[PDB]
């Protein structure tokens, strides 16, 4: 039955995320090849082909890029909500606790999964059809050059763990089903659900990664690292909100960030 929980979570992940690690690696290995964005000329070219509606009329390049960042996050929140609804037991939680778990978990899950589309030189964007370089993102004017580099730093060490989609699906489920989120109504029930998922994760890692006896505590630490990564990201987004008047924040993301940390 524990194998069944792991399989059901893996299947829910493959169904609900447009990108998975196998799909990303096929693209990054070299139909629909990714357009490389490494400078302003190629950003503008990519925009006209991949987000044409955005530039059909323009705001600084950094602000257009941040808009695309937010649009990606909004889409991934939808994918995570559907994934969560398919996590065995999640739908038996109080509806308001479901909202709370998503509120506090989506950006931890976003940055964990972002690692799957990152390598040391850049990342896949726009449903796998663009590859934006890490150096180009670092080249943007402040504060926008500060968004992605900590996420690359997290991803390089996370990717060195050589997890596959069967591991990552359980890891993301564990992120979502966290009993210590603020404001939960049924802490005990969520703690027991989490314990079940974490139990399956521990056993799955033991079987799938027999070479690394520390892999489970490494991943527990990555969960903690992601919390700090999100707090820091929320702080930067707040700097953007107050100082970059042209950088409209999407209302769903505003709701997630509100009263968070």
């Amino acid at each position: 039955d524990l194998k069944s929980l792991a399989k059901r979570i893996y299947e829910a992940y493959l169904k609900n995320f447009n990108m998975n690690k196998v799909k990303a690696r096929v693209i990054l290995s070299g139909n629909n090849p990714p357009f490389v964005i490494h400078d302003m000329e190629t950003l503008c070219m990519a925009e006209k082909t991949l987000v044409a509606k955005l530039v059909a009329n323009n705001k600084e390049a950094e602000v257009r890029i941040f808009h695309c960042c937010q649009c990606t996050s909004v889409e991934t929140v939808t994918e995570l909500t559907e994934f969560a609804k398919a996590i065995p037991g999640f739908a038996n939680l109080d509806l308001n606790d479901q909202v709370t778990l998503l509120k506090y978990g989506v950006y931890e899950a976003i940055f964990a999964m972002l690692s799957s589309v990152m390598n040391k030189d850049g990342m896949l964007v726009a449903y796998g059809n663009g590859f934006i370089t890490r150096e180009f993102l670092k080249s943007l004017r402040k504060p926008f050059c500060d968004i992605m580099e900590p996420k690359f730093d997290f991803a390089m060490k996370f990717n060195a763990l050589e997890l596959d989609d069967s591991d990552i699906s359980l890891f993301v489920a564990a992120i979502i089903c966290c009993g210590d989120r603020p404001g939960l109504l049924n802490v005990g029930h969520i703690e027991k659900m989490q314990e079940g998922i974490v139990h399956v994760l521990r056993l799955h890692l033991q079987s799938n990664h027999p070479d690394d006896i520390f892999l489970f505590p490494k991943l527990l630490q990555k969960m903690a690292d992601l919390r700090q990564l999100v707090t820091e990201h929320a702080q930067l987004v707040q700097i953007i909100k107050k100082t970059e008047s042209d950088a409209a924040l999407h209302p769903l993301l505003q709701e997630i960030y509100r009263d968070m940390y």
Binding site: N96, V99, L252, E255
Partner: peptide
């Protein structure tokens, strides 16, 4: 009726 709750309720 929040936006997140509306996502959760989507069929």
């Amino acid at each position: 009726p929040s936006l997140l709750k509306k996502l959760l309720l989507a069929p």
